[PDB]
Amino acid sequence: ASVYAWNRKRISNCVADYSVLYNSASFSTFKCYGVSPTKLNDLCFTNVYA
Amino acid sequence: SALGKLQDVVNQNAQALNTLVKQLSSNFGAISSVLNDILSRLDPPEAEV
């Protein structure tokens, strides 16, 4: 969808391994604010949104 | 309430300790007031500030 109608998916009951996303050589910009790009598997989030 | 000065000194010490404990749990303009969660979330180069 476009920016005026950006979707929002409330993802829960999820098992996230962000190491495969960061180590993909496909993402140009990975400005990861608030939390470090690495050392992310040692966290356990309440609820995420995409 | 006959002993007023001693009780006042004890209450002042207790209030000082309580204010110190409350300031321990303050953010001071940061992401959180704890250090272990900051170290686990952020990396040292960006969490140093």
Coordinates of all heavy atoms in Angstrom, one line a residue:
Chain A
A1 N 0.8 -1.2 0.0 CA 0.0 0.0 0.0 C 0.9 1.3 0.0 O 2.1 1.2 0.3 CB -0.9 0.0 1.2
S2 N 0.2 2.4 -0.3 CA 1.0 3.7 -0.4 C 1.1 4.2 1.0 O 0.8 3.6 2.0 CB 0.2 4.6 -1.3 OG 0.5 4.4 -2.7
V3 N 1.7 5.5 1.1 CA 1.9 6.1 2.4 C 0.7 6.6 3.0 O 0.6 6.7 4.2 CB 3.0 7.2 2.2 CG1 4.2 6.6 1.5 CG2 2.5 8.4 1.5
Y4 N -0.3 7.1 2.2 CA -1.5 7.6 2.8 C -2.4 6.6 3.4 O -3.3 6.9 4.2 CB -2.3 8.4 1.7 CG -3.0 7.5 0.7 CD1 -4.3 7.2 0.8 CD2 -2.3 7.1 -0.4 CE1 -4.9 6.4 -0.2 CE2 -2.9 6.3 -1.4 CZ -4.2 5.9 -1.2 OH -4.8 5.1 -2.2
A5 N -2.3 5.3 3.0 CA -3.0 4.2 3.5 C -2.1 3.0 3.9 O -2.3 1.9 3.6 CB -4.0 3.7 2.5
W6 N -1.1 3.4 4.7 CA -0.1 2.4 5.2 C -0.8 1.4 6.1 O -1.6 1.7 7.0 CB 1.0 3.1 5.9 CG 0.5 4.0 7.0 CD1 0.2 5.3 6.9 CD2 0.4 3.7 8.4 NE1 -0.2 5.8 8.1 CE2 -0.1 4.8 9.1 CE3 0.6 2.5 9.2 CZ2 -0.3 4.8 10.5 CZ3 0.4 2.5 10.5 CH2 -0.1 3.7 11.2
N7 N -0.5 0.1 5.8 CA -1.1 -1.0 6.5 C -0.5 -1.1 7.9 O 0.6 -0.6 8.1 CB -1.0 -2.3 5.7 CG -1.8 -2.3 4.4 OD1 -2.3 -1.2 4.0 ND2 -2.0 -3.4 3.8
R8 N -1.1 -1.9 8.8 CA -0.6 -2.1 10.1 C -1.0 -3.5 10.5 O -2.2 -3.8 10.7 CB -1.1 -1.1 11.1 CG -0.6 -1.2 12.5 CD -1.1 -0.1 13.4 NE -0.5 -0.2 14.7 CZ 0.5 0.5 15.1 NH1 1.1 1.3 14.2 NH2 1.0 0.5 16.3
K9 N 0.0 -4.4 10.7 CA -0.2 -5.8 11.1 C 0.3 -6.0 12.5 O 1.5 -5.9 12.8 CB 0.5 -6.7 10.1 CG 0.3 -8.2 10.4 CD -1.2 -8.6 10.1 CE -1.4 -10.1 10.2 NZ -1.2 -10.6 11.6
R10 N -0.7 -6.3 13.4 CA -0.4 -6.6 14.8 C 0.1 -8.0 14.9 O -0.7 -8.9 15.2 CB -1.6 -6.3 15.7 CG -1.3 -6.3 17.2 CD -2.4 -5.7 18.0 NE -2.8 -4.4 17.5 CZ -3.7 -3.6 18.1 NH1 -4.3 -4.0 19.2 NH2 -4.0 -2.4 17.5
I11 N 1.4 -8.2 14.8 CA 2.0 -9.5 14.9 C 2.2 -9.9 16.3 O 2.8 -9.1 17.1 CB 3.3 -9.6 14.1 CG1 3.0 -9.3 12.6 CG2 3.9 -11.0 14.2 CD1 4.3 -9.0 11.8
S12 N 1.7 -11.1 16.7 CA 1.9 -11.6 18.1 C 2.0 -13.1 18.0 O 1.7 -13.7 17.0 CB 0.7 -11.1 19.0 OG -0.5 -11.3 18.4
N13 N 2.5 -13.7 19.1 CA 2.8 -15.1 19.2 C 3.7 -15.5 18.1 O 3.4 -16.4 17.3 CB 1.5 -15.9 19.2 CG 0.5 -15.6 20.3 OD1 0.6 -16.3 21.4 ND2 -0.3 -14.7 20.2
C14 N 4.8 -14.8 18.1 CA 5.8 -14.9 17.0 C 7.2 -15.3 17.5 O 7.5 -15.0 18.7 CB 5.9 -13.5 16.3 SG 6.8 -13.3 14.7
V15 N 7.9 -16.0 16.7 CA 9.3 -16.3 17.1 C 10.2 -15.7 16.1 O 10.3 -16.1 14.9 CB 9.5 -17.9 17.2 CG1 9.1 -18.6 15.9 CG2 11.0 -18.2 17.5
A16 N 10.9 -14.6 16.5 CA 11.6 -13.7 15.6 C 13.1 -14.0 15.7 O 13.7 -14.1 16.8 CB 11.3 -12.2 16.0
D17 N 13.7 -14.2 14.5 CA 15.2 -14.3 14.4 C 15.6 -13.3 13.4 O 15.8 -13.5 12.2 CB 15.6 -15.7 14.0 CG 14.7 -16.3 12.8 OD1 13.7 -15.6 12.5 OD2 15.0 -17.4 12.3
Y18 N 15.9 -12.1 13.9 CA 16.3 -10.9 13.0 C 17.7 -11.1 12.5 O 18.1 -10.2 11.7 CB 16.1 -9.6 13.8 CG 14.7 -9.4 14.4 CD1 14.5 -9.6 15.7 CD2 13.7 -8.9 13.6 CE1 13.2 -9.4 16.2 CE2 12.5 -8.7 14.1 CZ 12.2 -8.9 15.4 OH 11.0 -8.7 15.9
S19 N 18.4 -12.1 12.8 CA 19.8 -12.3 12.3 C 19.7 -12.6 10.8 O 20.6 -12.2 10.0 CB 20.5 -13.4 13.0 OG 20.9 -12.9 14.3
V20 N 18.7 -13.3 10.4 CA 18.5 -13.6 8.9 C 18.1 -12.4 8.1 O 18.4 -12.3 6.9 CB 17.6 -14.8 8.7 CG1 16.1 -14.4 9.0 CG2 17.7 -15.4 7.3
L21 N 17.5 -11.4 8.8 CA 17.1 -10.2 8.1 C 18.2 -9.2 7.9 O 18.4 -8.6 6.9 CB 15.9 -9.6 8.8 CG 14.6 -10.4 8.9 CD1 13.5 -9.6 9.6 CD2 14.1 -10.9 7.5
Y22 N 19.0 -9.1 9.0 CA 20.1 -8.1 9.0 C 21.3 -8.7 8.1 O 21.9 -7.9 7.4 CB 20.7 -7.9 10.4 CG 21.9 -7.0 10.4 CD1 21.8 -5.7 10.3 CD2 23.2 -7.6 10.7 CE1 23.0 -4.9 10.3 CE2 24.3 -6.8 10.7 CZ 24.2 -5.4 10.5 OH 25.3 -4.6 10.6
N23 N 21.5 -10.0 8.1 CA 22.5 -10.6 7.3 C 21.8 -11.2 6.1 O 21.6 -12.4 5.9 CB 23.2 -11.7 8.1 CG 23.9 -11.2 9.4 OD1 23.5 -11.6 10.5 ND2 24.7 -10.2 9.2
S24 N 21.5 -10.3 5.1 CA 20.9 -10.7 3.9 C 21.5 -10.1 2.6 O 21.2 -10.5 1.5 CB 19.4 -10.4 3.9 OG 18.8 -10.8 5.1
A25 N 22.3 -9.0 2.8 CA 22.9 -8.3 1.7 C 21.9 -7.8 0.7 O 22.2 -7.7 -0.5 CB 24.0 -9.2 1.0
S26 N 20.7 -7.5 1.1 CA 19.7 -7.0 0.2 C 19.1 -5.6 0.7 O 18.8 -4.8 -0.1 CB 18.5 -8.0 0.1 OG 17.9 -8.1 1.4
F27 N 19.1 -5.4 2.0 CA 18.6 -4.2 2.6 C 19.7 -3.1 2.5 O 20.8 -3.3 3.0 CB 18.3 -4.4 4.1 CG 17.1 -5.3 4.3 CD1 17.0 -6.1 5.4 CD2 16.1 -5.5 3.3 CE1 16.0 -7.0 5.6 CE2 15.1 -6.4 3.5 CZ 15.0 -7.1 4.6
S28 N 19.4 -2.0 1.8 CA 20.3 -0.9 1.6 C 20.6 -0.2 2.8 O 21.7 -0.1 3.3 CB 19.8 0.0 0.5 OG 20.7 1.1 0.3
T29 N 19.5 0.4 3.4 CA 19.6 1.2 4.7 C 19.0 0.4 5.8 O 17.8 0.0 5.7 CB 19.0 2.5 4.5 OG1 17.6 2.4 4.2 CG2 19.6 3.3 3.4
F30 N 19.7 0.2 6.9 CA 19.3 -0.4 8.1 C 19.4 0.4 9.3 O 20.0 0.0 10.3 CB 20.0 -1.8 8.3 CG 19.2 -2.8 9.1 CD1 18.1 -3.4 8.7 CD2 19.7 -3.0 10.4 CE1 17.4 -4.3 9.5 CE2 19.0 -3.9 11.2 CZ 17.9 -4.6 10.8
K31 N 19.0 1.7 9.2 CA 19.1 2.6 10.3 C 18.2 2.1 11.4 O 16.9 2.2 11.4 CB 18.6 4.0 9.9 CG 19.2 4.5 8.6 CD 18.5 5.8 8.1 CE 18.5 5.9 6.6 NZ 17.3 5.1 6.1
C32 N 18.8 1.5 12.4 CA 18.0 0.7 13.5 C 18.1 1.6 14.8 O 19.0 1.5 15.6 CB 18.6 -0.7 13.7 SG 17.5 -1.9 14.5
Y33 N 17.0 2.4 14.9 CA 17.0 3.3 16.1 C 16.4 2.6 17.3 O 15.8 1.5 17.2 CB 16.1 4.5 15.7 CG 16.5 5.3 14.5 CD1 15.9 5.0 13.3 CD2 17.5 6.3 14.6 CE1 16.3 5.7 12.2 CE2 17.9 7.0 13.5 CZ 17.3 6.7 12.3 OH 17.7 7.4 11.1
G34 N 16.6 3.1 18.5 CA 16.0 2.6 19.7 C 16.6 1.4 20.2 O 16.7 1.2 21.4
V35 N 16.9 0.4 19.3 CA 17.5 -0.8 19.7 C 18.6 -1.1 18.7 O 18.6 -0.7 17.6 CB 16.5 -2.0 19.7 CG1 16.0 -2.4 18.3 CG2 17.1 -3.2 20.4
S36 N 19.7 -1.8 19.2 CA 20.8 -2.0 18.4 C 20.5 -3.0 17.2 O 19.6 -3.9 17.4 CB 22.0 -2.6 19.2 OG 21.6 -3.9 19.7
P37 N 21.1 -2.9 16.1 CA 20.9 -3.8 15.0 C 21.3 -5.3 15.4 O 20.6 -6.2 15.0 CB 21.7 -3.3 13.8 CG 22.0 -1.9 14.2 CD 22.0 -1.8 15.7
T38 N 22.4 -5.4 16.1 CA 22.8 -6.7 16.6 C 22.3 -6.8 18.1 O 21.7 -5.9 18.7 CB 24.3 -6.9 16.5 OG1 25.0 -5.8 17.2 CG2 24.7 -6.8 15.0
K39 N 22.7 -8.0 18.7 CA 22.3 -8.3 20.1 C 20.8 -8.2 20.2 O 20.3 -7.8 21.3 CB 23.0 -7.4 21.1 CG 23.4 -8.1 22.4 CD 24.0 -7.1 23.4 CE 25.3 -6.5 22.8 NZ 25.9 -5.6 23.8
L40 N 20.0 -8.5 19.2 CA 18.6 -8.4 19.2 C 17.9 -9.7 19.6 O 16.7 -9.7 20.1 CB 18.0 -7.9 17.9 CG 16.6 -7.4 17.8 CD1 16.2 -6.5 18.9 CD2 16.4 -6.7 16.4
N41 N 18.5 -10.8 19.4 CA 17.9 -12.1 19.8 C 17.8 -12.3 21.3 O 17.1 -13.2 21.7 CB 18.7 -13.3 19.1 CG 18.8 -13.2 17.6 OD1 19.9 -13.2 17.0 ND2 17.6 -13.2 17.0
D42 N 18.5 -11.5 22.1 CA 18.4 -11.6 23.5 C 17.3 -10.8 24.1 O 17.3 -10.5 25.3 CB 19.8 -11.2 24.1 CG 20.0 -11.8 25.5 OD1 19.2 -12.6 25.9 OD2 21.1 -11.5 26.1
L43 N 16.3 -10.4 23.3 CA 15.2 -9.6 23.8 C 13.9 -10.4 23.5 O 13.9 -11.4 22.8 CB 15.1 -8.3 23.0 CG 16.2 -7.3 23.3 CD1 15.9 -6.0 22.6 CD2 16.4 -7.1 24.8
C44 N 12.8 -10.0 24.1 CA 11.5 -10.7 24.1 C 10.4 -9.6 24.1 O 10.1 -9.1 25.2 CB 11.4 -11.7 25.2 SG 10.0 -12.9 25.0
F45 N 9.9 -9.2 23.0 CA 9.0 -8.0 22.9 C 7.6 -8.4 23.3 O 7.2 -9.5 23.1 CB 9.1 -7.4 21.5 CG 10.4 -7.0 21.0 CD1 11.2 -7.7 20.2 CD2 10.9 -5.7 21.5 CE1 12.4 -7.3 19.8 CE2 12.1 -5.3 21.1 CZ 12.9 -6.1 20.2
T46 N 6.9 -7.4 23.8 CA 5.5 -7.6 24.1 C 4.6 -7.8 22.9 O 4.0 -8.9 22.7 CB 5.0 -6.5 25.0 OG1 5.0 -5.3 24.2 CG2 5.8 -6.3 26.3
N47 N 4.6 -6.8 22.0 CA 3.8 -6.9 20.8 C 4.5 -6.0 19.8 O 5.0 -4.9 20.1 CB 2.4 -6.5 21.0 CG 2.2 -5.2 21.8 OD1 3.2 -4.6 22.2 ND2 1.0 -4.7 22.0
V48 N 4.6 -6.5 18.5 CA 5.3 -5.7 17.4 C 4.2 -5.3 16.4 O 3.1 -5.8 16.4 CB 6.4 -6.6 16.8 CG1 7.4 -7.0 17.9 CG2 5.8 -7.8 16.1
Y49 N 4.6 -4.4 15.5 CA 3.8 -3.9 14.5 C 4.6 -3.8 13.2 O 5.8 -3.4 13.3 CB 3.1 -2.6 14.8 CG 2.2 -2.6 16.0 CD1 2.7 -2.3 17.3 CD2 0.9 -2.9 15.9 CE1 1.9 -2.3 18.4 CE2 0.1 -3.0 17.0 CZ 0.5 -2.7 18.2 OH -0.3 -2.7 19.3
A50 N 4.0 -4.1 12.1 CA 4.7 -4.0 10.8 C 3.9 -3.1 9.8 O 2.8 -3.4 9.4 CB 4.8 -5.4 10.2
Chain B
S1 N 4.2 12.4 71.4 CA 5.0 13.3 70.6 C 5.9 14.2 71.4 O 6.2 15.3 71.0 CB 4.1 14.1 69.6 OG 3.0 14.6 70.3
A2 N 6.4 13.7 72.6 CA 7.2 14.5 73.4 C 8.6 14.7 72.8 O 9.1 15.8 72.7 CB 7.4 13.8 74.8
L3 N 9.2 13.6 72.3 CA 10.5 13.7 71.7 C 10.3 14.1 70.2 O 10.1 13.3 69.3 CB 11.2 12.3 71.7 CG 11.4 11.7 73.1 CD1 10.3 10.6 73.3 CD2 12.8 11.2 73.4
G4 N 10.4 15.4 70.0 CA 10.2 16.0 68.7 C 11.4 16.1 67.9 O 11.4 15.9 66.7
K5 N 12.6 16.5 68.5 CA 13.8 16.7 67.7 C 14.4 15.4 67.2 O 14.8 15.3 66.0 CB 14.8 17.4 68.6 CG 14.3 18.7 69.3 CD 15.4 19.5 69.9 CE 16.3 20.1 68.8 NZ 17.4 21.0 69.3
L6 N 14.4 14.3 68.0 CA 14.9 13.1 67.5 C 14.0 12.5 66.4 O 14.5 12.0 65.4 CB 15.0 12.1 68.7 CG 15.6 12.6 70.0 CD1 15.7 11.6 71.1 CD2 17.0 13.2 69.7
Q7 N 12.7 12.6 66.6 CA 11.8 12.1 65.6 C 11.9 12.9 64.3 O 11.8 12.3 63.2 CB 10.3 12.1 66.1 CG 9.3 11.5 65.1 CD 9.5 10.0 64.9 OE1 9.9 9.3 65.8 NE2 9.1 9.5 63.8
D8 N 12.1 14.2 64.4 CA 12.3 15.0 63.2 C 13.6 14.7 62.5 O 13.6 14.6 61.3 CB 12.4 16.5 63.6 CG 12.4 17.4 62.4 OD1 12.1 17.0 61.3 OD2 12.8 18.6 62.6
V9 N 14.7 14.4 63.3 CA 16.0 14.0 62.6 C 15.8 12.6 61.9 O 16.3 12.4 60.8 CB 17.1 13.9 63.7 CG1 18.3 13.2 63.1 CG2 17.5 15.3 64.1
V10 N 15.1 11.7 62.6 CA 14.9 10.4 62.0 C 14.0 10.5 60.7 O 14.3 9.9 59.7 CB 14.2 9.4 63.0 CG1 13.7 8.2 62.3 CG2 15.2 9.1 64.1
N11 N 13.0 11.4 60.7 CA 12.2 11.6 59.6 C 12.9 12.2 58.4 O 12.7 11.9 57.3 CB 10.9 12.4 59.9 CG 9.9 11.6 60.8 OD1 9.9 10.4 60.7 ND2 9.2 12.3 61.7
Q12 N 13.8 13.2 58.8 CA 14.6 13.8 57.8 C 15.6 12.8 57.1 O 15.7 12.8 55.9 CB 15.4 15.0 58.4 CG 14.6 16.3 58.6 CD 15.4 17.4 59.2 OE1 14.9 18.5 59.4 NE2 16.6 17.1 59.6
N13 N 16.2 12.0 57.9 CA 17.1 10.9 57.3 C 16.3 10.0 56.4 O 16.8 9.6 55.4 CB 17.8 10.2 58.4 CG 18.7 11.1 59.2 OD1 19.3 12.0 58.7 ND2 18.9 10.8 60.5
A14 N 15.1 9.6 56.9 CA 14.3 8.7 56.1 C 13.9 9.3 54.8 O 13.8 8.7 53.7 CB 13.1 8.2 56.9
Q15 N 13.5 10.6 54.8 CA 13.1 11.3 53.6 C 14.3 11.5 52.7 O 14.1 11.4 51.4 CB 12.5 12.7 54.0 CG 11.1 12.6 54.5 CD 10.6 14.0 55.0 OE1 11.3 14.9 55.0 NE2 9.3 14.0 55.4
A16 N 15.5 11.7 53.2 CA 16.7 11.8 52.4 C 16.9 10.5 51.7 O 17.2 10.4 50.5 CB 17.9 12.3 53.2
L17 N 16.9 9.4 52.4 CA 17.1 8.1 51.8 C 16.0 7.8 50.8 O 16.3 7.2 49.7 CB 17.1 7.0 52.9 CG 18.3 7.0 53.8 CD1 18.2 5.9 54.9 CD2 19.6 6.9 53.1
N18 N 14.8 8.1 51.0 CA 13.7 7.8 50.1 C 13.9 8.7 48.8 O 13.7 8.2 47.7 CB 12.3 8.1 50.7 CG 11.9 7.1 51.7 OD1 12.7 6.3 52.1 ND2 10.6 7.1 52.1
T19 N 14.3 9.9 49.0 CA 14.5 10.8 47.8 C 15.7 10.2 47.0 O 15.7 10.3 45.7 CB 14.8 12.2 48.2 OG1 15.6 12.3 49.3 CG2 13.4 12.9 48.5
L20 N 16.8 9.7 47.7 CA 17.9 9.1 47.0 C 17.4 7.9 46.2 O 17.8 7.7 45.0 CB 19.0 8.8 48.0 CG 20.4 8.5 47.4 CD1 21.0 9.8 46.8 CD2 21.3 7.9 48.4
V21 N 16.6 7.0 46.8 CA 16.1 5.8 46.1 C 15.2 6.2 44.9 O 15.3 5.6 43.9 CB 15.4 4.9 47.1 CG1 14.6 3.8 46.4 CG2 16.3 4.3 48.1
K22 N 14.4 7.3 45.1 CA 13.6 7.7 44.0 C 14.4 8.3 42.8 O 14.1 8.0 41.7 CB 12.6 8.7 44.5 CG 11.5 8.2 45.4 CD 10.7 7.1 44.6 CE 9.6 6.5 45.5 NZ 8.8 5.5 44.8
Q23 N 15.5 9.0 43.2 CA 16.4 9.5 42.1 C 17.1 8.4 41.5 O 17.5 8.6 40.3 CB 17.3 10.6 42.7 CG 16.7 11.9 43.1 CD 16.2 12.7 41.8 OE1 15.3 13.4 41.9 NE2 17.0 12.5 40.7
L24 N 17.4 7.3 42.2 CA 18.0 6.1 41.6 C 17.1 5.6 40.4 O 17.6 5.1 39.4 CB 18.2 5.1 42.6 CG 18.9 3.8 42.1 CD1 20.2 4.1 41.4 CD2 19.0 2.8 43.2
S25 N 15.8 5.6 40.6 CA 14.8 5.2 39.6 C 14.4 6.2 38.6 O 13.3 6.2 38.1 CB 13.6 4.5 40.3 OG 12.6 5.5 40.6
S26 N 15.2 7.3 38.4 CA 14.9 8.3 37.5 C 15.6 8.1 36.1 O 16.6 7.4 36.0 CB 15.4 9.7 38.1 OG 14.4 10.2 39.0
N27 N 15.1 8.7 35.1 CA 15.6 8.6 33.8 C 16.7 9.6 33.4 O 17.6 9.2 32.6 CB 14.4 8.7 32.7 CG 14.5 7.7 31.6 OD1 15.6 7.2 31.3 ND2 13.4 7.3 31.1
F28 N 16.6 10.8 33.9 CA 17.6 11.8 33.7 C 17.7 12.1 32.2 O 18.8 12.5 31.7 CB 19.0 11.5 34.3 CG 19.0 11.3 35.8 CD1 18.9 10.0 36.3 CD2 19.0 12.4 36.6 CE1 18.9 9.9 37.7 CE2 19.0 12.3 38.0 CZ 18.9 11.0 38.5
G29 N 16.7 11.9 31.4 CA 16.7 12.2 30.0 C 17.3 11.0 29.2 O 18.1 11.3 28.3
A30 N 17.0 9.8 29.5 CA 17.5 8.6 28.8 C 16.4 7.7 28.3 O 15.2 8.1 28.4 CB 18.5 7.8 29.7
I31 N 16.7 6.6 27.8 CA 15.7 5.6 27.3 C 15.1 4.9 28.4 O 13.8 4.6 28.4 CB 16.3 4.7 26.2 CG1 15.2 3.7 25.7 CG2 17.5 4.0 26.8 CD1 15.7 2.9 24.5
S32 N 15.8 4.5 29.5 CA 15.3 3.8 30.6 C 16.2 4.2 31.8 O 17.2 4.8 31.7 CB 15.4 2.3 30.4 OG 14.8 2.0 29.1
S33 N 15.7 3.7 33.0 CA 16.4 4.0 34.3 C 17.2 2.8 34.8 O 17.7 2.9 35.9 CB 15.3 4.5 35.3 OG 15.9 4.5 36.6
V34 N 17.3 1.8 34.0 CA 18.0 0.6 34.4 C 19.2 0.4 33.4 O 19.1 0.9 32.2 CB 17.2 -0.7 34.4 CG1 16.0 -0.5 35.4 CG2 16.6 -0.9 33.0
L35 N 20.3 -0.2 33.8 CA 21.5 -0.3 33.0 C 21.6 -1.7 32.3 O 22.1 -1.7 31.1 CB 22.7 -0.1 33.8 CG 23.2 1.4 34.0 CD1 23.5 2.0 32.7 CD2 22.2 2.2 34.8
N36 N 21.1 -2.7 32.9 CA 21.2 -4.0 32.3 C 20.3 -4.2 31.0 O 20.8 -4.7 30.0 CB 20.8 -5.1 33.3 CG 19.6 -4.7 34.1 OD1 19.0 -3.7 33.9 ND2 19.2 -5.5 35.1
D37 N 19.1 -3.6 31.1 CA 18.3 -3.7 29.9 C 18.8 -2.8 28.8 O 18.7 -3.1 27.6 CB 16.8 -3.2 30.2 CG 16.2 -4.1 31.3 OD1 16.6 -4.1 32.4 OD2 15.2 -4.9 30.9
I38 N 19.4 -1.7 29.1 CA 20.1 -0.8 28.1 C 21.2 -1.5 27.5 O 21.4 -1.5 26.3 CB 20.5 0.5 28.8 CG1 19.3 1.4 29.0 CG2 21.5 1.2 27.9 CD1 19.6 2.8 29.6
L39 N 22.1 -2.2 28.3 CA 23.2 -3.0 27.7 C 22.7 -4.2 26.9 O 23.4 -4.5 25.9 CB 24.1 -3.5 28.9 CG 24.9 -2.4 29.6 CD1 25.7 -3.1 30.8 CD2 25.9 -1.8 28.6
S40 N 21.6 -4.8 27.2 CA 21.1 -5.9 26.5 C 20.4 -5.4 25.2 O 20.5 -6.2 24.1 CB 20.1 -6.7 27.3 OG 19.0 -6.0 27.6
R41 N 19.8 -4.3 25.2 CA 19.1 -3.8 24.0 C 20.1 -3.1 23.0 O 20.3 -3.5 21.9 CB 18.0 -2.8 24.3 CG 16.8 -3.4 25.0 CD 15.8 -2.4 25.4 NE 16.3 -1.4 26.4 CZ 15.7 -0.4 26.8 NH1 14.4 -0.1 26.5 NH2 16.3 0.5 27.7
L42 N 20.8 -2.1 23.5 CA 21.7 -1.3 22.6 C 23.1 -1.9 22.7 O 23.4 -2.7 23.6 CB 21.7 0.2 23.1 CG 20.4 0.9 23.1 CD1 20.5 2.2 23.8 CD2 19.9 1.1 21.6
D43 N 23.9 -1.4 21.7 CA 25.3 -1.8 21.7 C 26.1 -0.7 22.5 O 25.7 0.4 22.5 CB 25.8 -2.0 20.3 CG 25.5 -0.8 19.4 OD1 26.1 0.3 19.7 OD2 24.7 -0.9 18.5
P44 N 27.3 -1.1 23.0 CA 28.1 -0.2 23.8 C 28.4 1.1 23.0 O 28.3 2.2 23.6 CB 29.4 -1.0 24.1 CG 28.9 -2.4 24.1 CD 27.8 -2.5 23.1
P45 N 28.8 1.0 21.7 CA 29.1 2.3 21.0 C 28.0 3.3 20.9 O 28.2 4.5 20.9 CB 29.5 1.8 19.6 CG 30.0 0.4 19.8 CD 29.1 -0.1 20.9
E46 N 26.7 2.8 20.9 CA 25.6 3.7 20.9 C 24.9 3.9 22.2 O 24.2 4.9 22.4 CB 24.6 3.3 19.8 CG 23.6 2.2 20.3 CD 22.5 1.9 19.4 OE1 21.6 2.8 19.3 OE2 22.4 0.9 18.8
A47 N 25.1 3.0 23.2 CA 24.6 3.1 24.5 C 25.5 3.9 25.4 O 25.2 4.1 26.6 CB 24.3 1.7 25.1
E48 N 26.7 4.2 25.0 CA 27.7 4.9 25.8 C 27.1 6.3 26.2 O 27.4 6.8 27.3 CB 29.0 5.0 25.2 CG 29.1 6.0 24.0 CD 30.3 5.8 23.1 OE1 31.3 5.3 23.6 OE2 30.3 6.2 21.9
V49 N 26.4 6.9 25.3 CA 25.8 8.3 25.6 C 24.8 8.2 26.7 O 24.7 9.0 27.6 CB 25.3 8.9 24.3 CG1 26.5 9.1 23.3 CG2 24.2 8.2 23.7

